[PDB]
């Protein structure tokens, strides 16, 4: 009578009730989503897949806080994999990452997220060591930072994004300073000029944002 439904009113209503419970308390929301059949089971794989696919339907801040919880490393690791970071520079991968959830604010929380991201990022690449070069401009397969190196670069990228787009900054960080501070950070050696240059110019020309 009231709604055609096929506008799927009943499904939407329970989804809204379930997601509200999740945004409030994942500890309560997840089991409700499972009970209602929106999540297949209580496995990290099923929960991770649901979170990953419904990033624009639930509170991204809550999602981020759930993922960075010390005892949720298993979930975080299942979740981080769903991403395809293959053939992308670290900054391009970060942009993709931050479209699914919002980074938490505390030190140890950010660290847990970036650690998972860095390991996943490296796992997604085909690091053929014979290809390593400091001058194969624009050839992504020739720069192979290990997890610790990606972790450091990731922090530098978030840092740079803030500096270059902060109107309060008198003199935005120059490429020389951005790259200089990164010396010895690519497997204890330097990142190739072109890699940091493309990173720097990309961040400069398009702020990483939202969620």
Swiss-Prot record:
Free-text disruption phenotype from the record: Exacerbates the cold sensitivity of a DRS2-knockout.
Domain of life assignment: Eukaryota
Subunit architecture: Interacts (via SEC7 domain) with DRS2 (via C-terminus); the interaction is direct. Interacts with GMH1.
Signal sequence interval, chain numbering: none
Top-level taxonomy: Eukaryota, Fungi, Dikarya, Ascomycota, Saccharomycotina
Extra facts: Present with 7700 molecules/cell in log phase SD medium.
Protein name according to UniProt: ARF guanine-nucleotide exchange factor 2
Its biological purpose: Activates the ARF proteins by exchanging bound GDP for free GTP. Plays a role in maintaining mitochondrial morphology. Stimulates DRS2 flippase activity.
Residue ranges of domain SEC7 in the record: 22-166
Subcellular location: Cytoplasm, Cytosol; Membrane; Golgi apparatus membrane
């Amino acid at each position: 009578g009231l709604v055609p439904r096929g506008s799927h009113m009943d499904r939407k209503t329970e989804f809204i009730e379930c997601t509200n419970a999740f945004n409030e308390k994942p500890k309560k929301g997840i089991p409700m989503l499972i009970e209602k059949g929106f999540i297949a089971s209580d496995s990290d794989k099923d929960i991770a897949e649901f979170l990953f696919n419904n990033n624009n339907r639930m509170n991204k801040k809550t999602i981020g806080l759930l993922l960075c919880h010390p005892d949720k490393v298993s979930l975080l690791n299942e979740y981080i994999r769903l991403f395809d970071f293959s053939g992308l520079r670290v900054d391009e991968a970060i942009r993709i990452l931050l479209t699914k959830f919002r980074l938490p604010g505390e030190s140890q929380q950010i660290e847990r997220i970036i650690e998972a991201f860095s390991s996943a990022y490296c796992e997604n690449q085909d690091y053929d060591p014979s290809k390593i070069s400091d001058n194969a401009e624009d050839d992504i397969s020739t720069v192979q930072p290990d997890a610790d190196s990606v972790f450091i670069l990731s922090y530098s990228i978030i840092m740079l994004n803030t500096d270059l787009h902060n109107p309060q900054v008198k003199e935005h960080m120059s490429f020389e300073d951005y790259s200089g501070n990164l010396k010895g950070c690519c497997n204890h050696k330097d990142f190739p000029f072109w890699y940091l240059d493309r990173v720097y110019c990309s961040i400069r020309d398009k702020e990483i944002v939202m969620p």
